[PDB]
Write a protein that binds this ligand. Sequence first.
Ligand SMILES: [Mg+2]
Ligand SMILES: [Mg+2]
Lengths: 44, 149, 116
Amino acid sequence: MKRTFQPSVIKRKRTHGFRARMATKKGRQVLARRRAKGRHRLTV
Amino acid sequence: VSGGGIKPWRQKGTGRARAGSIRSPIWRGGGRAFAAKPQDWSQKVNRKMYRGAMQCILAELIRQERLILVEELTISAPKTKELIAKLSELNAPRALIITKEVDENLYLAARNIPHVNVLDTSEVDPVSLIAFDKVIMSVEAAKQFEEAL
Amino acid sequence: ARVKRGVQANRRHKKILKRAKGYYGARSRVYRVAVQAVTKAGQYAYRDRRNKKRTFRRLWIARINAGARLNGLSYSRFINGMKKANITIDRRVLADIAMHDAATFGALVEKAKAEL
RNA sequence: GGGUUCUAACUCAGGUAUAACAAUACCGAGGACAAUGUAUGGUGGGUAGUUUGACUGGGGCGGUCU
RNA sequence: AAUUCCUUGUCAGGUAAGUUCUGACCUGCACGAAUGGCAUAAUGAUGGCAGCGCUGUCUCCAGCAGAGACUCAGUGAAAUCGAAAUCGCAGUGAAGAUGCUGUGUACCCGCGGCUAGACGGAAAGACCCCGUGAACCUUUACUACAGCUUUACAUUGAAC
RNA sequence: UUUAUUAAAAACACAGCACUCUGCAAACACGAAAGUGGACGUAUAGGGUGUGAUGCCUGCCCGGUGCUGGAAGGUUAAUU
RNA sequence: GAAGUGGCAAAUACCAUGCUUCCAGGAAAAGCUUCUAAGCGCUAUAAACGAAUCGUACCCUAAACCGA
RNA sequence: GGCUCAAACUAGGAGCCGAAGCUGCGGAUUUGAAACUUGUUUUCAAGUGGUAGGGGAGCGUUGUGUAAGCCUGUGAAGGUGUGUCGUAAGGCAUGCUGGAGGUAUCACAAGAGCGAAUGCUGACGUGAGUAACGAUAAUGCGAGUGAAAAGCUCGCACGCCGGAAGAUCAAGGGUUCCAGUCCAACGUUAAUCGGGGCUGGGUGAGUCGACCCCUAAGGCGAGGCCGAAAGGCGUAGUCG
RNA sequence: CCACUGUCGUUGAAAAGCCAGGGGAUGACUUGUGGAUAGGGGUGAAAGGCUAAUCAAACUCGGUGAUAGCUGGUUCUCCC
RNA sequence: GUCAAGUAAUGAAGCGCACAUGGUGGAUGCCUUGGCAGUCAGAGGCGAUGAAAGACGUGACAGCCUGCGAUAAGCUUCGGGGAGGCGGCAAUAUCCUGUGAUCCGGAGAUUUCUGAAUGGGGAAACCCACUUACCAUAAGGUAGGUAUCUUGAAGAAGCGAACGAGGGGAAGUGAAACAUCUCAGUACCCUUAGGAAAAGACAUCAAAUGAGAUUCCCCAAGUAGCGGCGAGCGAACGGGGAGAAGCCGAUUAAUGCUAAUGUAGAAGAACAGCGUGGGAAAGCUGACCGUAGUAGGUGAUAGUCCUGUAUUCGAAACAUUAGCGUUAACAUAUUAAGUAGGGCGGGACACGAGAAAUCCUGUCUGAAGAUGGGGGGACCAUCCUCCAAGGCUAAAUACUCCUGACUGACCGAUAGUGAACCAGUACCGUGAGGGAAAGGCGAAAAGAACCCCUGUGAGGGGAGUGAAAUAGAACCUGAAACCGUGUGCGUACAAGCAGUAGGAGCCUCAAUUUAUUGGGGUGACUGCGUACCUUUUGUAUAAUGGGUCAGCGACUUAUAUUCUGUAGCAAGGUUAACCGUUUAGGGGAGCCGUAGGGAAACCGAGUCUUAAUAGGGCGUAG
Ligand SMILES: [Mg+2]
Ligand SMILES: [Mg+2]
């Protein structure tokens, strides 16, 4: 049956992407937190 | 300990012993129940108790002949062999030399001799007095000890 | 000063497993089972130190009864005859005589029977 | 001690000009009202935080509690 | 009666026989008129009852086909599991015993079946009670608050 | 139409009916406000509530609690 | 190293963004064609030369995607 | 079991069995009492079942000092046997293994002792060589290659789909595509085969699509409005 | 597109399916792509449904080692 | 010899126990490249000259890591250094190097694209431009410019530890419920600095002989108070210290001298013989150095073998710290009215409206102005004290993303960072986010030429190396669970926690002048005998928990307080913070004891109550 993840690149990059993170103060805090943890993947 | 904020599984129904954190002290990689922190190990020893113990130690050293009074002990050159000779004639190769106003080249001559230390009477301690095979005290330092204790 | 438990735990478990030598299955192999089997073995041995003194008197009395009935007396009359004759021979020695020396036990029966 | 009228505060989610929104100017309509701040009475499960005893031949019901 | 406890009410119809059904009575525990009343063609994978057809639903199961099961070769799980040299019975006993008493029976070990017991597995019983536990919901419980509203002062003035 | 994953229904909706609110910067709703939806609509409209095609219809009670109107009197805040 | 043209049938594709009816009344903007404003190139005829960059394999009712 | 002048019952008598009770023998220990008197010695008396719990005495382990010591390649720690000593915790010696450390004694400090917590991690059992091997569309044989062929290739025959189980895409994936080579792992079996490993290759546009021009919903939004701050809204626009 | 009945399956081929039947099938229809509404909030032809296999208040992190008159566990030895 | 009756022994499909020898597994021990907690100092930022963080490239060589940026493991120069070298896994090839390489330190050059990202846009690492100058003639190339905001060309933006200041501000919890209250002005959100910040010079306290800003520490003191007077909350005065400072420019940024530092470096003592051993540093014998003797290595443990250590020391260049000088930016009040005070509502004060001073202010008001005003805890009088409504000000105090040196009764691979290893990785999740496992041959690869079996596989056996190969790469040691093989004994007529007390037989070692004892293995047969933990009145319980093994896993730490022991002093005992060339010595502030009674004043071996001098209460070695 239909499952929860239905991938779409535009939708992924528009809800979770780098510019979407940088558009908000809270998204920039997400990025600051990911960089402080040292993640090799900042954004999808 | 890093992480550990979420409940690892739900309380009932999984058939597992209930858990609250993955960093509980029961788990491998968990925190220490009663983790140690820095401690201050210094004690308050009473002034009179310290003085009386130094008194007791000095008397015991005389009583077992481990104290040697000399008029003076002055090395004329910062040279280890000179102090080795001066201590071999005194028959105390392994010695704590207590002198008032430790000379700034007797210190150098004593620095490299293994079981030999040179102290001024203000920086003598009970463990130093007990630890060395012999004590070589000048008469001036014995007088200072008379006054201090 | 961190203490590791490995070496002492090992030697501790080896003492128990050594006392469990010869037991069946897990009882000689695995510690949780061996340690119960060793404790129960000690419990049985304590109880049977007491019970063996009862069992051997049982055996001596049986042998004395047989020896006396061979000579025409029961145990309860033979022992009474010994106590009346002031004979202090214990049941262990009397059973030994009955088993290994029939003529001497005949003589003892004669003494008891003369005392009755 | 209440009304009435006025306009000049204030209002316009009216017209005209300013490109558009808004502001501004004027006109028009209202107008010391409305509205808002502080204080205050009412209303207020719309929303919150909580309480809602114990004994007891299981508990509730009844009874009891000094 | 989707409503009636007594209750399978009573009487009629249907069956050989009908606590259901249909019609009627009214003694409505405890119907009733827009929390609508009484009907109503059409409609409904809606509820009840009755027929024809049809049948392996059944009397009462038989035979047959395929896929497993079974045997061989290859691969190779699972829950469970204190340890087991793990029988019946009548007793006993923390009160329903493979394990205790007495007794009876029983050579050692598989495989195919089977599910009477191992108070079998599975899920720290949801029932029930307890805890000065939780939550969410209700209200004419309490105490607040939002909102709505009253008046005083301010913004706020003039004349009669 | 509905309880995705044990309930598809007699439940919800429905066209239709009634009550009630609302004169427009509407009532009402989101929002702290600005700004919005209602609606570039305007009482034959829009909101809330109940009922639920249709046919025949829809009795009595305003004591309670709401709602609407009234203000003679009683009581009554801040303030003074 | 051949043939390659006649009949009949026939789409839901095309004519057709058409036509006819209905009410529940049916995107926008640009390209495109014209008109002028401030201000100070355009239309034909050709000839030559150009048209960048990215994608392009393969699965896709699936063993390549979403379901460990 | 079996029992009848009992192996039943009543009334008496004498023997004997029978407990971790009592006695005997040896040993330990608590308290108290007496004396060489901090175990220095001998005794004596009364004691010594024990959960919750109180009191007393110790064992071992890691680490610090003692220790620039002492032990140790003539073999440390650890492992694994054996012998021996103590009331116990445990100590000592030693064979084998091991191959570089250990630590007397007395103090001192604890990450100081594990069988349970449906404890935590890893390893490995039992179930059990049991169930299953994923659509009942289906396979047979001959050749080939190969260590080996039911499964690969080729051939003949058979069967299945055919509004698909054929073909083209979008989305998503990203090399899976093609060739050669390999068969450990992966593939629910084998595999010479593969979407597996390894090495090479392969995607060619003015016209197909994107980009680009344009805008929808909806975003963002010089100025502007609003809001403790953060921010919210909104015009022109700018994206989409 | 849906999900009424039954068998099967229930350590499944599958964390909701298969098979055989069943309903709607020009409409209040189904479906692609993009967008909007966010947690006491949303959305709801209303089942407390749904809001990423999570819903009478999502998820993640943090307050936080919440609290737990409750349950479990609590490791060497000997003597009184 | 027949028959009859009776009675042994022998059996093993398999299984048990012990021992021997392996497999698996990876404990233990040793080890460390990594962590953890601090001390003494330094520093406290980076960025429009484009940061942090990335993407994509870059090599003789395929990937990853490291460095670097189309000048791409690098280019120039200035110093150091002196023989090797072209980063690691990780070697190979071509080569470079005394014409001074590699390497180290200072400076410079280059520095793709993304990202504040800044020419516009955007699904980050992409798409699309405009414009100036020049060159080209074609469809371009080179060098620039073009965001927004603030201030009048200069700045800003963004990022990043903790500590500061400020704007908002929970709840769980505690009160054995809960609402005041607590938690707590905490968590968290938001804003914004500096090396610190803030505060700071009296419109402050005190009531003493008065003192003299701020901050921090020890006391005062868990006192006075506050408080559903509950749970709790909790000062100040003053004393002792650290540090001291007062001003009206105690500002900021450059530049230039002088000094010092730092950023590479240099030299640097002294051991031999013999024996063992694979190897000597260990043993024996005898020497030497020492301003250098407990450093790390080296084939076992080294003052004399190496690197080091003691000691002495270097700088072309750049940074930093100070002192000086100078510049250019900003600042430079002149004594303070919408102020003090007041009404209402709140907040802060230890203080919850209280008898509530004092501070702050949303709302409404509103002085005096030195012949005046503020405070002294309602308020009034007197007395003391001090002048708000202008601004500033070092130190002593807070901290650690970092740099250097040093330290540890800190860990040692389930520990210590989550991370010793290509870890914030794999993996999981739409996402925010969650989040592992995983170290060790040997001294040196000497990492096993060659031969044999096998499919040119895997794996092994020889040969060889090595001290050692059950050290052979899954490699130190190599436990247990678990699973084999071998040997000995037992076991196929017998009912149950599997042992125990006895006990025959057999097997095996030793003695012993020779089948008897002793040791070991097994255990026919007899008696007895229902696991452990937990929880209970009571459990074989058919009540709980555990499949097993290994490893880990639970009464701590800090402070206060009371009692006990012990030690020192003793009617006295003891200092704290601090200072200290630091366990000492100094520091007597304070605390406890030495007297109690009473609400208190007050009195005191007494005192309280009372009219009472009575009675009665409480009182009469630390
Ligand atoms: Mg769901
Ligand atoms: Mg090994």
